[PDB]
Amino acid sequence: MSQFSKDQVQDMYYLSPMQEGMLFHAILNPGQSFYLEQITMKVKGSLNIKCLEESMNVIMDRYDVFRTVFIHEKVKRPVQVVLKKRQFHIEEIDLTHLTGSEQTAKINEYKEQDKIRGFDLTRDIPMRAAIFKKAEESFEWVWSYHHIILDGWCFGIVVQDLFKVYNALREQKPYSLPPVKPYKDYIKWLEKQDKQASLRYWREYLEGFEGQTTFAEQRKKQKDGYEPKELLFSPSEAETKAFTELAKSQHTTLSTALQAVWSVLISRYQQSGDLAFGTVVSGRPAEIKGVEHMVGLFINVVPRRVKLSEGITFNGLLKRLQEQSLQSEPHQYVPLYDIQSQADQPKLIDHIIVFENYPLQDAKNEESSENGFDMVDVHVFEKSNYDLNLMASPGDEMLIKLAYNENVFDEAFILRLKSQLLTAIQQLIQNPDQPVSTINLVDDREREFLLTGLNPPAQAHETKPLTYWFKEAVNANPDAPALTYSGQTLSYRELDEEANRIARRLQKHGAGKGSVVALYTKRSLELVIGILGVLKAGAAYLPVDPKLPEDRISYMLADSAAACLLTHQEMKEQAAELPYTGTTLFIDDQTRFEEQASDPATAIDPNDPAYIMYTSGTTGKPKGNITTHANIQGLVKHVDYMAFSDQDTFLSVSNYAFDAFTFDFYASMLNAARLIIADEHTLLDTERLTDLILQENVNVMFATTALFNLLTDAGEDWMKGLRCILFGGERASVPHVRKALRIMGPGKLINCYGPTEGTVFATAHVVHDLPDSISSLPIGKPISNASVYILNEQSQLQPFGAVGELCISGMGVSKGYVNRADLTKEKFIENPFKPGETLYRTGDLARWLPDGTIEYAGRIDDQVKIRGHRIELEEIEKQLQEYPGVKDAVVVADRHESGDASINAYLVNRTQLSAEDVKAHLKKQLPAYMVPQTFTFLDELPLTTNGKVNKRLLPKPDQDQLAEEWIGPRNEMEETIAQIWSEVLGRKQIGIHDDFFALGGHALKAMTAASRIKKELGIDLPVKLLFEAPTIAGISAYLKNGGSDGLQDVTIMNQDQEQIIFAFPPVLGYGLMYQNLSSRLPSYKLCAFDFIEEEDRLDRYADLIQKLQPEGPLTLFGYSAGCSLAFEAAKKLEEQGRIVQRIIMVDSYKKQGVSTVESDVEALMNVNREAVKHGLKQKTHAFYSYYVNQVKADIDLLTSGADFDIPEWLASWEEATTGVYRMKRGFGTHAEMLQGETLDRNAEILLEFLNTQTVTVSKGEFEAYVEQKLISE
């Protein structure tokens, strides 16, 4: 039964590793046309097919690979066997009698048979060709070959030779082709190499790589499936020349150039200079002297890792890349999945870059003069393997293609990427010696959009001291209440006078301009009078928090140069033992009334200091920021983030040492509102706060985020009378904001973000929507006098949507840090996009959302990438702080001699919680990659001087904590699937977290194991995808989250309505079909199931609908075989106790008995001709089979429009129900009922049933329903 004899054998040899993998893929996963290439060539002209066949047979002799077949069945290592002679035939077909469309349809038909047919590498010639005659000089030509013996590059050499021969033979002319070095020579080379050394090289290359999701923030996560989509573009002719000429003067490939510019582009999307992507390489090693003319498999996809060192330029980068290209050459035979199997990274590479050496498309279509025919078109079949592919081929102006999965990426994004690539190509090559980090990558349209389009408008209005704005508010209505504390209220008049008095006494004692005045007040009326007096005297105030330690005050005193100190009397221990030999004056003091209650005429410059408050940033001692009159005008005047008025009553709950208070005081007092100052003991006390709010009729308030959440958890009454609630300081807690929103309504909650150095907040998000699918609350849009720029480290504008350092400019930017020119120069810079202005570098990370609001991404100094996931280390810290009974906790990240980082948690507690207590909590609270790897317990954390944060050197964690609990199969599933692993790897005692390749696994077994689940004791799953899923847990994850029937698998349509219907599948077995029916079901939400092939499929639906709808009247559906399924379903419902309102059968009847299996599954698929097509036979085979071999629910049948004679083994449902068996006649025969215009007539009727409409309700039943739906809230 062997198809060949020993005589036929000319030679034999072993397979390249790549080949070897392709072969096994084939054996185990045939039909999936992974390695089938198919090139269609549109040929216009005269074609001697006979001569072309003969010419193909010459090529057949010329190249061993075409006479090669493979042996694998019973043999330790597979073998390639070259045969002496194989005769090639071109299937010739005439379609001249058909229409254009008909010809096209037939050819598309041949192609699809061809794609599923594949090759049998045991026997077939691994290439075939069909030629279709469309008209007299019009042909379409379909070549097909298996990748196991050729790559695209080779293919062209073959076609070139085919045509020299072709042209020679048809003119009866001699010819000569050069000697061809056999593919066997590459195998010999390959056999001289050390596979483990090559593996080592890659492992070292990728050592310490922290992984990458390219364009992570732009990716859509919605349902799977590839939606192929394409964007063709090219630079200018000039741009292409300078590009091309630069690659040469630097002596590198066009390919390497392209990858250099790409690296810089993704550099700006990944927040990183350690970068990776796939590249296709020639696989043709220098050391085989004529390697460049051999024909067979060489090309390979391999990873490129690029490290953009500080200051690296383009030419530096080119050098870098060309250099490692060489180093890699001897190792390109290693299959990518072996490169990954030892790597650390699942998502190692994400996307790939191709510069097709010389495309089959562009190269082949040249001079019909010699060939006698024109190849008008060429078209290769491309298998969408990555979600984004950059591909380029040379030309006068270079042809670039971004080929992508639009289920993942928006065309809008691929469009921006295009223009950023084009800008990249220009700027990089124009400026090939500048640090790459310095190059600009945004076009003018985008640059304008980002700077101008995303920021507020330019405003005229400008500038006037606070004293002036205050005079405005006072003159408005002197009798209006201005200030209140503990009952005692003051009018704008009274407050003004008490402040003029204080402004004069100050001015007398030599405060004036250029000095700082130290406030030392507990919250009181005086506090506020102090502030005004200081401003009115032309000075700057320094709030001193009475609760601070003596020595932190003494620092602030000296540093600020505070010439004077202004106090209280309940603070009469301003003596205490501070000390302070400066002048100190009380506004307790009754001697104040001696001076005038008119103000002085204190000429003030807006840009002069208004105040100083210190913050902790400069790890060590705290730093004073200088805030300005004009600064403060920016926050409160000419701003359209809502408007405050004479009619508002503010409550200040913010300590006057923090610039939240500057909002409290200035937003009220400069809009003529009432300011209520909460007493010290009310600040963090939600009951007092709620009462003060209630008794004072407060309508506006700023709370820290912690207080806001605190209040929100305590009660609702406090918020019910508020018209506006600002909060900020930490990341908004969405659950809490969602709670506030529902009580308060939209336009009320405002989330505010800002460093001190930007004066309180630079952006604000007024909450209106709160989408159920909401990760983090935006920090919104800049306030009217501020600007925001998302920049890289070198002040380059990031792509719209990329993460970068949030920088601020506009009126709010402070005059910098007291006595510290070094720090000011570091954080504060000249605004590159606006002469005259200053830019503050916040240290925070952010991106613009598509809506122009801003999403906060954490601190630069608090980031860690794990498994391609940017992790914010403060988000895990806060989860530890909240865990009942915790006290302190910090999290460091470190890597060893590699770059391969991990996260250690540290906790002080006592002896309350054991080590794993904390781990159990985070397990489900936080995602897996954010869970710390150790949990060292301390009495306390080290500090270093003024250190809320700690002396980083905590102890290197104890390694017992690396040893964790072995967890063997949890269920009967994993046991049997751990059985095959055990069998395959030949190793006992495997836990569900053990690595397959770490256990001795490799290429074949990874497949061979995924095969044993694929039938032979199993149930089928992706083969080359245990490299994907190396842990049994990860594969239980793949097949429970994305396996069969669950949250994703059984189709849903019409989501944001309500009224559920529960469909059942037709004979073919898939709910995807009623998708086309869902449209004509406008109000009803659909559950389109699949067919479950198991005998106890009964209980699976019993579990499914119980989840999807727990109680009430149930409505089932069934078309075709889905009927007797849906009946054998409601019986169980009401057997297990669940009321079914009604069922709607559609042209299918009762099983009153029983009556070939595959041929009629094929014959009925022949009246119905991978994701939807792969498992289509073996499921339809079983459901069609299941078919051939009472309930309380009302049944409604919609019958065919065609007449019908009933079998004895079929019958009406009349008997099969106790209730109303109503029924109607539809339009269309059994097939066409649920497709086309016939479906749309059958729809209206399906209402009539579901409609019913009359459905007479009782008054008690109606009222109750109403009050029921209401209480829901």
Ligand SMILES: CC(C)C[C@H](N)C(=O)O
């Ligand atoms: C976010 C900013 C408004 C800062 C403010 N001082 C706060 O407590 O949140």
